[PDB]
Amino acid sequence: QDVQAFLKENEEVIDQKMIEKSLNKLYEYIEQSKNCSGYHPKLVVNGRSIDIEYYECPVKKQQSLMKSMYIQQDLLGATFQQVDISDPSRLAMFQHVTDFLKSYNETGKGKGLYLYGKFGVGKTFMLAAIANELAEKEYSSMIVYVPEFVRELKNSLQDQTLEEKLNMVKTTPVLMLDDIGAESTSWVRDEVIGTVLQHRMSQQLPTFFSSNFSPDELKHHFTYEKEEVKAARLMERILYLAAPIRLD
Amino acid sequence: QDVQAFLKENEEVIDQKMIEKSLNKLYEYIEQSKNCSYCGYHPKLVVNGRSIDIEYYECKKQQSLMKSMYIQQDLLGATFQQVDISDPSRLAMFQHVTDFLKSYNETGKGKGLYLYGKFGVGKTFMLAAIANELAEKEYSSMIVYVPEFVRELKNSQTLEEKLNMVKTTPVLMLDDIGAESWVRDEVIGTVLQHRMSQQLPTFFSSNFSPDELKHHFTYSQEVKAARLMERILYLAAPIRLDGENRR
């Protein structure tokens, strides 16, 4: 009922066929729960690929703490009593929130989580849930938006410009990284947002890590011998700051 | 003329070119001919993908448009009158038969029904209420026991001539589904995928409420588990059947 509308809206742009190529996507789309009403997902055409951007809900004392860059403040507001649990493993999370603030101090160490799904499975309400309570106190879990962050963190690592806004992805007691896999020079893997993984298990910090998809399969994604038994160990460099749980 | 009726039914799916491609089918469809004789099926149009195909549905003068195998027909004492507008059941069960009795045959777009609730009420007295008085509107309907067919295709030489006649005729009333790796998806779970480009209704009866029927098909550890139950929530209208002990 939405796809039809979008299709004809951009049918001048959206080359044809593909259905069979994106079969997996469209089938996974219908198979899942999907749906939604601080933001909403909308499709956008970026070059030759179609992405999913969040626009603030038109329906629009923690946000002096909960200020995240490269995403807006209309769409950061979800709690834990705002709870109508319908799908499974959204239930298997009632000891990874209340007990994910009682011992996540400053250099507490261990294993958080690895959120995933497709492109909008109430992720911005669980990365907005679990965290709030940490910052409801003087504890830690920074919000950050990677697909928007990096867009100039290739060409802003310069003359103090963003140089000085970009050492705090390494030193805040905790910090999250969002829907990477969106786009991507390969230096940022080990210079901008791969510099989040070595300086956080060397002094060790209880950091959150999210994504469009999962670490166990984010190990073979980018091959547009090398990164196969070599693309797995960044999902390993990921695997130790957190303990993975389902999002069915 | 048959093509016109089917088109409006599947006009959301069919395109102008689809019409000219399936011309032979739609033209063969018409020819007036109401049907066959005996001595068993009738031709109906069923768009496959980008092509429209022709599938055969199986065929004191009312219950003849209402034959049955595997169950009984003495039970057909389950009609419109003595069964009264009683519960959330029959405050909406005869209506979604009669609002439809004015739009019968294959023309405009369509659905079926679904039957559930709890003990004692009915699933076999309301699929016999979209039936015998449908032997009054030029188009016949069906009464067949789905579970009575689930113990002979494990133990059954041409059995690829049987399932192309009991699924693409004017009406489907796939009975009770909710008891006891499932061939159900070839036997009962592929009684839907040709009812798309051929436009064919799927009435069902069952055992569980509308938040419960997607979990009776195999257990392990889903992305594939509810394929049918989405296609068995669209081509119909489900209502709350709960009244007195009439079973």
Tab-separated table of C-alpha atoms in Angstrom:
chain	number	residue	atom	x	y	z
A	1	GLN	CA	0.000	0.000	0.000
A	2	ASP	CA	3.087	2.210	0.305
A	3	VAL	CA	5.371	0.518	-2.179
A	4	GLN	CA	2.795	1.071	-4.943
A	5	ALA	CA	2.658	4.774	-4.145
A	6	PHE	CA	6.438	5.151	-3.992
A	7	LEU	CA	6.946	3.072	-7.133
A	8	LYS	CA	4.779	5.296	-9.310
A	9	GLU	CA	6.092	8.381	-7.541
A	10	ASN	CA	9.641	7.687	-8.644
A	11	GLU	CA	8.908	5.295	-11.535
A	12	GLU	CA	10.675	7.727	-13.854
A	13	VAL	CA	13.822	7.211	-11.792
A	14	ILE	CA	13.479	3.647	-10.511
A	15	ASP	CA	14.859	1.526	-13.329
A	16	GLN	CA	12.819	-1.639	-13.829
A	17	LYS	CA	13.215	-5.370	-13.243
A	18	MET	CA	15.419	-5.924	-10.201
A	19	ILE	CA	12.449	-7.425	-8.360
A	20	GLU	CA	14.199	-10.782	-8.725
A	21	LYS	CA	17.515	-9.260	-7.643
A	22	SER	CA	15.970	-7.637	-4.570
A	23	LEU	CA	13.811	-10.743	-4.060
A	24	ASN	CA	15.466	-11.526	-0.740
A	25	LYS	CA	14.741	-7.994	0.448
A	26	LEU	CA	11.116	-7.892	-0.687
A	27	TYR	CA	10.485	-11.365	0.727
A	28	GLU	CA	12.133	-10.492	4.043
A	29	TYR	CA	10.072	-7.294	3.961
A	30	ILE	CA	6.728	-9.094	3.841
A	31	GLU	CA	7.828	-11.879	6.179
A	32	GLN	CA	8.694	-9.528	9.065
A	33	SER	CA	6.336	-7.399	11.157
A	34	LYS	CA	7.432	-4.012	9.815
A	35	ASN	CA	5.342	-0.877	10.333
A	36	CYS	CA	5.674	2.301	12.398
A	37	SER	CA	3.638	5.240	13.692
A	38	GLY	CA	10.790	10.144	16.971
A	39	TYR	CA	11.434	9.581	13.280
A	40	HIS	CA	10.014	7.474	10.438
A	41	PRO	CA	11.892	5.591	7.688
A	42	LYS	CA	11.659	6.850	4.102
A	43	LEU	CA	13.368	5.623	0.953
A	44	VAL	CA	15.827	7.842	-0.897
A	45	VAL	CA	17.750	7.278	-4.117
A	46	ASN	CA	21.457	7.927	-3.659
A	47	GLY	CA	23.293	7.415	-6.911
A	48	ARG	CA	22.718	3.811	-7.957
A	49	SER	CA	21.613	2.608	-4.532
A	50	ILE	CA	18.435	3.209	-2.549
A	51	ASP	CA	18.901	4.095	1.115
A	52	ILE	CA	16.672	4.527	4.133
A	53	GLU	CA	16.650	7.911	5.835
A	54	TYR	CA	14.669	8.932	8.879
A	55	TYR	CA	12.494	12.020	8.814
A	56	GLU	CA	11.225	13.497	12.065
A	57	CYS	CA	7.691	12.527	13.042
A	58	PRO	CA	5.352	15.397	11.961
A	59	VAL	CA	3.439	14.791	15.191
A	60	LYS	CA	6.309	16.565	16.948
A	61	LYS	CA	14.830	16.238	31.695
A	62	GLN	CA	17.224	14.130	29.608
A	63	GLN	CA	18.319	15.691	26.315
A	64	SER	CA	21.055	17.963	27.655
A	65	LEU	CA	22.563	14.542	28.271
A	66	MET	CA	20.892	12.925	25.231
A	67	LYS	CA	22.249	15.181	22.472
A	68	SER	CA	23.402	13.146	19.468
A	69	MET	CA	24.922	14.612	16.308
A	70	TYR	CA	24.150	13.741	12.653
A	71	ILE	CA	20.596	12.834	13.688
A	72	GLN	CA	17.783	15.096	15.026
A	73	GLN	CA	16.193	15.772	18.470
A	74	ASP	CA	12.559	15.244	17.379
A	75	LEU	CA	13.212	11.512	17.118
A	76	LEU	CA	15.082	10.782	20.392
A	77	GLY	CA	12.388	9.863	22.928
A	78	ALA	CA	11.503	6.317	24.014
A	79	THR	CA	11.410	4.716	27.464
A	80	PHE	CA	10.745	1.394	29.198
A	81	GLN	CA	7.262	1.932	30.597
A	82	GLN	CA	6.373	2.838	27.018
A	83	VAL	CA	6.074	-0.941	26.677
A	84	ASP	CA	3.549	-2.988	24.628
A	85	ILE	CA	5.742	-6.047	23.837
A	86	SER	CA	4.280	-7.980	20.883
A	87	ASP	CA	7.187	-9.756	19.087
A	88	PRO	CA	9.636	-12.259	20.742
A	89	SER	CA	13.209	-11.416	21.893
A	90	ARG	CA	11.849	-7.902	22.469
A	91	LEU	CA	10.835	-9.798	25.613
A	92	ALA	CA	14.281	-11.406	26.136
A	93	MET	CA	15.617	-7.939	27.014
A	94	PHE	CA	14.189	-7.393	30.535
A	95	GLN	CA	17.551	-8.029	32.206
A	96	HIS	CA	19.733	-6.249	29.608
A	97	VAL	CA	18.380	-2.800	30.525
A	98	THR	CA	17.704	-2.627	34.291
A	99	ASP	CA	20.906	-4.614	34.884
A	100	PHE	CA	22.723	-2.678	32.162
A	101	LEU	CA	22.918	0.439	34.357
A	102	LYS	CA	23.614	-1.011	37.841
A	103	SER	CA	27.252	-1.858	36.982
A	104	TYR	CA	28.099	0.202	33.836
A	105	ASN	CA	30.203	2.852	35.614
A	106	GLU	CA	33.466	4.363	34.298
A	107	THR	CA	35.707	1.567	32.873
A	108	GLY	CA	33.356	-1.262	33.974
A	109	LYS	CA	34.008	-3.624	31.048
A	110	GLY	CA	32.291	-6.703	29.601
A	111	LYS	CA	29.583	-7.207	26.994
A	112	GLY	CA	26.707	-4.985	25.766
A	113	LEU	CA	24.599	-5.889	22.672
A	114	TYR	CA	24.491	-5.935	18.806
A	115	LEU	CA	21.170	-4.617	17.504
A	116	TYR	CA	20.087	-5.460	13.948
A	117	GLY	CA	17.132	-6.217	11.660
A	118	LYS	CA	16.518	-4.701	8.237
A	119	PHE	CA	15.978	-0.960	7.818
A	120	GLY	CA	13.585	0.153	10.630
A	121	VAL	CA	12.636	-2.525	13.203
A	122	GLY	CA	12.097	-0.258	16.246
A	123	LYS	CA	15.870	0.132	16.582
A	124	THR	CA	15.750	3.871	17.330
A	125	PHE	CA	13.525	3.086	20.352
A	126	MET	CA	15.867	0.500	21.915
A	127	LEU	CA	19.019	2.499	21.227
A	128	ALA	CA	16.852	5.216	22.777
A	129	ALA	CA	15.541	2.926	25.533
A	130	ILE	CA	18.426	1.045	27.261
A	131	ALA	CA	20.673	4.143	27.120
A	132	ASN	CA	18.409	6.821	28.708
A	133	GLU	CA	18.524	5.119	32.126
A	134	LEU	CA	22.336	5.160	32.091
A	135	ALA	CA	22.236	8.906	31.417
A	136	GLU	CA	19.225	9.209	33.752
A	137	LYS	CA	22.107	8.864	36.175
A	138	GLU	CA	25.686	10.031	35.667
A	139	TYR	CA	26.518	6.881	33.676
A	140	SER	CA	27.256	6.299	30.022
A	141	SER	CA	26.002	5.537	26.460
A	142	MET	CA	26.622	8.218	23.757
A	143	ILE	CA	24.412	8.435	20.640
A	144	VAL	CA	26.092	9.051	17.250
A	145	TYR	CA	25.022	8.678	13.584
A	146	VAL	CA	27.643	6.955	11.376
A	147	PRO	CA	26.146	7.053	7.843
A	148	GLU	CA	25.816	10.836	8.400
A	149	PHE	CA	28.965	11.268	10.534
A	150	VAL	CA	31.484	9.874	7.994
A	151	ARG	CA	30.188	11.851	4.931
A	152	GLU	CA	32.859	14.487	5.624
A	153	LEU	CA	34.972	12.608	8.214
A	154	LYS	CA	37.008	11.767	5.148
A	155	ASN	CA	37.437	15.476	4.296
A	156	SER	CA	37.217	17.149	7.734
A	157	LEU	CA	40.035	15.349	9.560
A	158	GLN	CA	41.762	18.685	8.957
A	159	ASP	CA	43.000	21.981	10.472
A	160	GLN	CA	41.260	21.462	13.857
A	161	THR	CA	37.976	21.790	11.878
A	162	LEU	CA	36.368	18.484	12.869
A	163	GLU	CA	39.730	17.163	14.120
A	164	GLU	CA	38.626	18.424	17.536
A	165	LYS	CA	35.095	16.967	17.459
A	166	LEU	CA	36.564	13.569	16.541
A	167	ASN	CA	38.678	12.347	19.477
A	168	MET	CA	35.554	11.888	21.661
A	169	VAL	CA	34.552	8.771	19.706
A	170	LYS	CA	37.524	7.255	21.595
A	171	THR	CA	37.239	8.687	25.142
A	172	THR	CA	33.604	9.078	26.334
A	173	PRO	CA	33.099	6.317	28.967
A	174	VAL	CA	30.661	4.726	26.441
A	175	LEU	CA	29.569	5.525	22.837
A	176	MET	CA	27.378	3.875	20.161
A	177	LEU	CA	27.770	3.550	16.373
A	178	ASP	CA	24.663	3.212	14.166
A	179	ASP	CA	23.647	1.873	10.723
A	180	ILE	CA	27.071	1.428	9.098
A	181	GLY	CA	27.157	-0.658	5.924
A	182	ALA	CA	25.568	2.448	4.427
A	183	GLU	CA	28.085	3.422	1.722
A	184	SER	CA	31.783	2.357	1.871
A	185	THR	CA	38.284	5.206	0.774
A	186	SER	CA	38.756	2.283	3.190
A	187	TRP	CA	40.791	4.234	5.789
A	188	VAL	CA	37.738	5.135	7.931
A	189	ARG	CA	37.553	1.361	8.717
A	190	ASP	CA	40.753	1.849	10.720
A	191	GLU	CA	40.955	5.678	11.057
A	192	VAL	CA	37.550	7.186	11.932
A	193	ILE	CA	35.085	4.490	13.087
A	194	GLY	CA	37.576	1.641	13.246
A	195	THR	CA	39.470	3.841	15.711
A	196	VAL	CA	36.542	3.118	18.048
A	197	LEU	CA	37.492	-0.554	18.514
A	198	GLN	CA	41.174	-0.594	19.630
A	199	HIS	CA	41.098	2.343	22.084
A	200	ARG	CA	38.059	0.790	23.787
A	201	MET	CA	39.326	-2.726	24.495
A	202	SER	CA	42.817	-1.505	25.455
A	203	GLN	CA	41.491	0.372	28.487
A	204	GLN	CA	38.193	-1.556	28.008
A	205	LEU	CA	34.781	0.200	28.082
A	206	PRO	CA	31.120	-0.985	28.169
A	207	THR	CA	30.160	0.387	24.741
A	208	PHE	CA	26.991	-0.266	22.717
A	209	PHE	CA	27.206	-1.314	19.027
A	210	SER	CA	24.317	-1.329	16.534
A	211	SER	CA	23.899	-1.958	12.793
A	212	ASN	CA	21.457	-2.552	9.919
A	213	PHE	CA	22.395	-6.255	10.200
A	214	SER	CA	24.339	-8.772	12.373
A	215	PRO	CA	28.054	-9.442	13.266
A	216	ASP	CA	27.931	-13.187	12.394
A	217	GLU	CA	26.970	-12.296	8.801
A	218	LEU	CA	28.532	-8.799	8.595
A	219	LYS	CA	31.705	-10.851	8.111
A	220	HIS	CA	31.267	-11.407	4.350
A	221	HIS	CA	29.340	-8.319	3.140
A	222	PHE	CA	31.741	-5.963	1.332
A	223	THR	CA	33.323	-7.728	-1.667
A	224	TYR	CA	31.989	-5.590	-4.570
A	225	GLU	CA	42.627	-14.063	-1.225
A	226	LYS	CA	41.225	-11.126	0.843
A	227	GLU	CA	38.263	-9.916	2.991
A	228	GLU	CA	36.394	-13.153	3.735
A	229	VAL	CA	38.672	-14.684	6.310
A	230	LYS	CA	39.602	-10.988	6.735
A	231	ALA	CA	36.203	-9.212	6.819
A	232	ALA	CA	35.178	-11.368	9.799
A	233	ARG	CA	37.584	-9.880	12.341
A	234	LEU	CA	36.037	-6.393	12.339
A	235	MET	CA	32.835	-8.126	13.434
A	236	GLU	CA	35.193	-9.767	15.904
A	237	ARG	CA	36.813	-6.418	16.843
A	238	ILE	CA	33.136	-5.678	17.408
A	239	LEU	CA	32.241	-8.991	19.187
A	240	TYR	CA	34.049	-8.252	22.515
A	241	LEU	CA	32.542	-4.901	23.600
A	242	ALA	CA	29.105	-6.533	23.615
A	243	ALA	CA	27.024	-9.753	23.842
A	244	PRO	CA	24.610	-10.254	20.873
A	245	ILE	CA	20.804	-10.704	21.167
A	246	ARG	CA	18.009	-11.248	18.594
A	247	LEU	CA	15.688	-8.728	16.936
A	248	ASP	CA	13.075	-10.885	15.192
B	1	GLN	CA	-17.739	-11.637	-21.454
B	2	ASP	CA	-15.995	-13.936	-18.952
B	3	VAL	CA	-12.760	-12.086	-19.530
B	4	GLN	CA	-14.477	-8.789	-18.653
B	5	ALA	CA	-15.708	-10.248	-15.375
B	6	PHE	CA	-12.332	-11.749	-14.472
B	7	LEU	CA	-10.463	-8.606	-15.514
B	8	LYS	CA	-12.400	-6.354	-13.152
B	9	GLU	CA	-11.619	-9.030	-10.578
B	10	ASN	CA	-7.922	-8.978	-11.365
B	11	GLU	CA	-7.738	-5.568	-13.099
B	12	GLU	CA	-5.254	-4.485	-10.443
B	13	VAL	CA	-2.961	-7.274	-11.613
B	14	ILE	CA	-3.786	-7.582	-15.312
B	15	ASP	CA	-2.620	-5.076	-17.911
B	16	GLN	CA	-3.974	-4.205	-21.350
B	17	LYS	CA	-1.234	-6.331	-22.895
B	18	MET	CA	-1.995	-9.182	-20.505
B	19	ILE	CA	-5.497	-9.149	-21.997
B	20	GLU	CA	-4.183	-9.483	-25.551
B	21	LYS	CA	-1.698	-12.155	-24.456
B	22	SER	CA	-4.375	-14.160	-22.648
B	23	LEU	CA	-6.829	-13.342	-25.451
B	24	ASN	CA	-7.141	-16.987	-26.430
B	25	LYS	CA	-7.964	-17.887	-22.837
B	26	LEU	CA	-10.506	-15.115	-22.279
B	27	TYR	CA	-12.137	-15.811	-25.635
B	28	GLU	CA	-12.270	-19.559	-24.975
B	29	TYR	CA	-13.649	-18.671	-21.546
B	30	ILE	CA	-16.680	-16.842	-22.944
B	31	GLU	CA	-18.500	-18.621	-25.772
B	32	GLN	CA	-21.519	-18.423	-23.464
B	33	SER	CA	-21.324	-22.097	-22.492
B	34	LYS	CA	-22.358	-22.209	-18.837
B	35	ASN	CA	-20.265	-25.347	-18.283
B	36	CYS	CA	-19.876	-29.089	-18.886
B	37	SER	CA	-22.249	-32.032	-18.473
B	38	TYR	CA	-21.283	-35.297	-16.774
B	39	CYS	CA	-20.476	-37.663	-17.973
B	40	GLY	CA	-16.521	-32.617	-14.234
B	41	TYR	CA	-14.723	-29.286	-14.153
B	42	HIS	CA	-15.197	-25.765	-15.556
B	43	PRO	CA	-12.576	-23.413	-17.048
B	44	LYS	CA	-11.602	-20.280	-15.123
B	45	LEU	CA	-8.991	-17.642	-15.886
B	46	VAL	CA	-5.891	-17.398	-13.679
B	47	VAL	CA	-3.111	-14.914	-14.598
B	48	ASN	CA	0.291	-16.437	-13.899
B	49	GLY	CA	2.988	-13.844	-13.540
B	50	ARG	CA	2.696	-11.946	-16.818
B	51	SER	CA	0.509	-14.524	-18.538
B	52	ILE	CA	-3.124	-15.487	-18.036
B	53	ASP	CA	-3.848	-19.217	-17.899
B	54	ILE	CA	-6.926	-21.401	-17.846
B	55	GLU	CA	-7.417	-23.672	-14.854
B	56	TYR	CA	-10.254	-26.085	-14.251
B	57	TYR	CA	-12.212	-25.984	-11.023
B	58	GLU	CA	-14.435	-28.906	-10.074
B	59	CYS	CA	-18.117	-28.500	-10.895
B	60	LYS	CA	-34.487	-30.767	-5.006
B	61	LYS	CA	-32.354	-28.719	-7.433
B	62	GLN	CA	-30.088	-26.722	-5.080
B	63	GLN	CA	-27.699	-29.159	-3.406
B	64	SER	CA	-26.544	-30.202	-6.920
B	65	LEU	CA	-24.512	-27.007	-7.169
B	66	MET	CA	-23.312	-28.144	-3.724
B	67	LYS	CA	-21.755	-31.653	-4.015
B	68	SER	CA	-19.189	-33.011	-1.515
B	69	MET	CA	-16.555	-35.736	-1.081
B	70	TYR	CA	-14.858	-37.054	2.106
B	71	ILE	CA	-17.486	-35.579	4.484
B	72	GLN	CA	-21.307	-35.815	4.407
B	73	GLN	CA	-24.346	-33.877	3.101
B	74	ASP	CA	-27.008	-34.852	5.668
B	75	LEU	CA	-25.420	-32.073	7.762
B	76	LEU	CA	-26.482	-29.500	5.136
B	77	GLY	CA	-29.265	-28.710	7.603
B	78	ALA	CA	-27.388	-25.561	8.616
B	79	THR	CA	-29.166	-22.889	6.560
B	80	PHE	CA	-30.149	-19.178	6.870
B	81	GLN	CA	-33.397	-19.280	8.916
B	82	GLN	CA	-33.467	-21.133	12.288
B	83	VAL	CA	-29.817	-20.189	12.822
B	84	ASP	CA	-30.332	-16.655	14.146
B	85	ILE	CA	-28.396	-13.374	14.424
B	86	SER	CA	-27.044	-14.327	17.862
B	87	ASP	CA	-23.451	-13.405	18.789
B	88	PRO	CA	-20.460	-11.396	17.519
B	89	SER	CA	-20.683	-14.564	15.429
B	90	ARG	CA	-23.990	-14.093	13.625
B	91	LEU	CA	-24.202	-10.358	14.239
B	92	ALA	CA	-21.767	-10.672	11.313
B	93	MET	CA	-21.780	-14.029	9.437
B	94	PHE	CA	-24.827	-14.152	7.149
B	95	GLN	CA	-24.210	-10.525	6.124
B	96	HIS	CA	-20.744	-11.223	4.709
B	97	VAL	CA	-22.546	-13.813	2.599
B	98	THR	CA	-25.578	-11.713	1.518
B	99	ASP	CA	-23.783	-8.372	0.883
B	100	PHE	CA	-21.818	-10.695	-1.367
B	101	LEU	CA	-24.897	-12.550	-2.722
B	102	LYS	CA	-25.609	-9.328	-4.662
B	103	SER	CA	-22.099	-9.323	-6.176
B	104	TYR	CA	-21.862	-12.999	-7.244
B	105	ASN	CA	-20.071	-14.590	-10.236
B	106	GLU	CA	-16.578	-13.467	-11.434
B	107	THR	CA	-16.415	-9.697	-12.217
B	108	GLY	CA	-15.375	-7.142	-9.543
B	109	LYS	CA	-12.502	-7.694	-7.074
B	110	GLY	CA	-12.998	-10.217	-4.213
B	111	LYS	CA	-12.382	-12.082	-0.915
B	112	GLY	CA	-13.690	-15.080	1.105
B	113	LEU	CA	-14.302	-15.612	4.860
B	114	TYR	CA	-12.577	-17.044	7.968
B	115	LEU	CA	-14.261	-18.898	10.852
B	116	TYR	CA	-12.944	-19.129	14.440
B	117	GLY	CA	-13.719	-18.509	18.142
B	118	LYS	CA	-14.176	-21.175	20.840
B	119	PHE	CA	-16.033	-24.409	21.790
B	120	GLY	CA	-19.573	-25.403	20.784
B	121	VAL	CA	-20.221	-22.556	18.326
B	122	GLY	CA	-19.657	-23.242	14.605
B	123	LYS	CA	-17.335	-23.683	11.626
B	124	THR	CA	-19.430	-26.285	9.753
B	125	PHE	CA	-22.849	-24.600	10.084
B	126	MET	CA	-21.656	-21.327	8.466
B	127	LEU	CA	-19.790	-22.795	5.469
B	128	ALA	CA	-23.187	-24.373	4.760
B	129	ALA	CA	-24.626	-20.828	4.826
B	130	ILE	CA	-22.643	-19.655	1.791
B	131	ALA	CA	-23.845	-22.686	-0.148
B	132	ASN	CA	-27.375	-23.951	-0.887
B	133	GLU	CA	-28.976	-20.536	-1.470
B	134	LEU	CA	-25.975	-20.052	-3.738
B	135	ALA	CA	-27.683	-22.639	-5.917
B	136	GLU	CA	-29.894	-19.663	-6.813
B	137	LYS	CA	-27.325	-17.224	-8.314
B	138	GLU	CA	-25.972	-18.960	-11.483
B	139	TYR	CA	-22.661	-19.766	-9.714
B	140	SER	CA	-22.073	-22.833	-7.541
B	141	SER	CA	-19.962	-23.175	-4.352
B	142	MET	CA	-18.069	-25.820	-2.325
B	143	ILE	CA	-18.298	-27.920	0.885
B	144	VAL	CA	-15.203	-30.116	1.480
B	145	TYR	CA	-13.363	-31.358	4.560
B	146	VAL	CA	-9.743	-30.190	4.425
B	147	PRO	CA	-8.576	-32.480	7.287
B	148	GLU	CA	-10.231	-35.530	5.671
B	149	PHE	CA	-7.791	-35.132	2.753
B	150	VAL	CA	-4.707	-35.172	5.046
B	151	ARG	CA	-4.294	-38.983	5.317
B	152	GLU	CA	-4.196	-40.304	1.704
B	153	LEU	CA	-1.560	-38.219	-0.135
B	154	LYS	CA	0.986	-39.722	2.258
B	155	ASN	CA	-0.377	-43.096	1.121
B	156	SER	CA	-1.416	-42.919	-2.539
B	157	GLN	CA	-0.718	-43.747	-11.453
B	158	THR	CA	-1.519	-40.121	-12.315
B	159	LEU	CA	-1.989	-37.983	-9.194
B	160	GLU	CA	-1.019	-34.812	-11.080
B	161	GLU	CA	-4.522	-34.273	-12.523
B	162	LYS	CA	-6.362	-34.055	-9.181
B	163	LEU	CA	-5.134	-30.781	-7.653
B	164	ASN	CA	-5.726	-28.606	-10.752
B	165	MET	CA	-9.510	-28.885	-10.336
B	166	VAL	CA	-10.105	-28.477	-6.601
B	167	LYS	CA	-8.607	-24.973	-6.348
B	168	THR	CA	-9.345	-22.767	-9.418
B	169	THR	CA	-13.163	-23.063	-9.742
B	170	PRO	CA	-15.464	-20.103	-8.707
B	171	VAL	CA	-15.362	-20.848	-4.922
B	172	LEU	CA	-13.036	-22.299	-2.237
B	173	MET	CA	-14.125	-23.145	1.321
B	174	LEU	CA	-10.959	-24.671	2.869
B	175	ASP	CA	-12.301	-26.214	6.100
B	176	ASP	CA	-10.947	-26.627	9.664
B	177	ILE	CA	-7.203	-25.954	10.131
B	178	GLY	CA	-5.847	-26.315	13.703
B	179	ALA	CA	-4.857	-29.726	15.108
B	180	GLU	CA	-1.870	-32.141	15.461
B	181	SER	CA	8.190	-30.370	7.949
B	182	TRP	CA	4.653	-30.094	6.480
B	183	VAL	CA	3.192	-31.175	3.109
B	184	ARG	CA	0.328	-28.929	4.239
B	185	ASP	CA	2.171	-26.303	2.212
B	186	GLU	CA	1.831	-28.348	-0.998
B	187	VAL	CA	-1.569	-29.833	-0.164
B	188	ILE	CA	-3.286	-26.839	1.523
B	189	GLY	CA	-0.559	-24.149	1.473
B	190	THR	CA	-0.421	-24.048	-2.314
B	191	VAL	CA	-4.178	-23.611	-2.753
B	192	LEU	CA	-3.631	-19.829	-2.855
B	193	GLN	CA	-0.794	-18.919	-5.253
B	194	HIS	CA	-2.893	-19.387	-8.444
B	195	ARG	CA	-5.818	-17.526	-6.883
B	196	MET	CA	-3.853	-14.346	-7.575
B	197	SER	CA	-3.685	-13.869	-11.374
B	198	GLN	CA	-6.837	-15.988	-11.753
B	199	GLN	CA	-8.727	-14.124	-8.953
B	200	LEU	CA	-10.171	-16.806	-6.647
B	201	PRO	CA	-11.687	-16.456	-3.108
B	202	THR	CA	-10.414	-18.284	0.000
B	203	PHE	CA	-12.963	-18.960	2.739
B	204	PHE	CA	-11.559	-20.860	5.751
B	205	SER	CA	-12.702	-22.386	9.049
B	206	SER	CA	-10.450	-22.991	12.081
B	207	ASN	CA	-9.714	-23.445	15.833
B	208	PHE	CA	-7.886	-20.280	17.105
B	209	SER	CA	-8.309	-16.457	17.454
B	210	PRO	CA	-6.806	-13.897	14.955
B	211	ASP	CA	-3.517	-13.644	16.884
B	212	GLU	CA	-2.881	-17.436	17.027
B	213	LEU	CA	-3.060	-19.301	13.656
B	214	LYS	CA	0.460	-18.508	12.409
B	215	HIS	CA	1.971	-21.044	14.842
B	216	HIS	CA	0.730	-24.574	14.042
B	217	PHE	CA	3.116	-25.390	11.143
B	218	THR	CA	6.365	-27.101	12.353
B	219	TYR	CA	8.827	-26.235	15.120
B	220	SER	CA	12.610	-25.805	15.202
B	221	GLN	CA	13.983	-22.265	15.712
B	222	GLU	CA	10.823	-17.238	11.622
B	223	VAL	CA	11.447	-15.837	8.126
B	224	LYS	CA	9.385	-18.576	6.401
B	225	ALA	CA	6.850	-19.795	9.000
B	226	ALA	CA	3.875	-17.537	8.136
B	227	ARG	CA	3.884	-17.461	4.299
B	228	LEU	CA	0.386	-18.923	4.069
B	229	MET	CA	-1.111	-17.104	7.057
B	230	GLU	CA	-0.624	-13.749	5.322
B	231	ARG	CA	-2.237	-15.155	2.177
B	232	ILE	CA	-4.775	-16.695	4.597
B	233	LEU	CA	-5.610	-13.280	6.110
B	234	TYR	CA	-6.326	-11.319	2.915
B	235	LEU	CA	-8.641	-13.149	0.472
B	236	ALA	CA	-11.346	-13.323	3.186
B	237	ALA	CA	-13.210	-11.640	6.079
B	238	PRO	CA	-12.846	-13.141	9.620
B	239	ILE	CA	-15.404	-12.740	12.471
B	240	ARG	CA	-15.921	-13.751	16.158
B	241	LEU	CA	-18.046	-16.940	16.305
B	242	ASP	CA	-19.056	-17.580	19.954
B	243	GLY	CA	-22.565	-18.643	21.031
B	244	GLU	CA	-24.549	-21.546	22.494
B	245	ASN	CA	-23.624	-25.257	22.459
B	246	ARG	CA	-24.763	-26.148	18.920
B	247	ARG	CA	-22.228	-28.981	18.560
